Amino acid sequence: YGFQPTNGVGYQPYRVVVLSFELLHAPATVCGPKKSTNLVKNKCVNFNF
Amino acid sequence: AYTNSFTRGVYYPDKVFRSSVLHS
Structure with a gap:
């Protein structure tokens, strides 16, 4: 590419980042931010581990 | 030499x- 500052859009350079989330078969890893919370029991509950 | 597993x-x-689960 011979990039030059006086190029019409669609010929100017764009920087690209491709994030690819993969899930092999480990025990866990990075994730969003959760506030967690105590653990109940013996009670019908709605859980996320 | 060669051998048999x-x-x-x-x-x-x-x-x-x-x-106990004959898993395939």
């Missing part, structure tokens, strides 16, 4: 517990 080289395909 008999029943060798079996590994747990992954995590996940499991009990």
Whole structure:
């Protein structure tokens, strides 16, 4: 590419980042931010581990 | 020399517990 500052859009350079989330078969890893919370029991509950 | 394995080289395909279950 011979990039030059006086190029019409669609010929100017764009920087690209491709994030690819993969899930092999480990025990866990990075994730969003959760506030967690105590653990109940013996009670019908709605859980996320 | 060459030799014969008999029943060798079996590994747990992954995590996940499991009990009596002829799993394929």
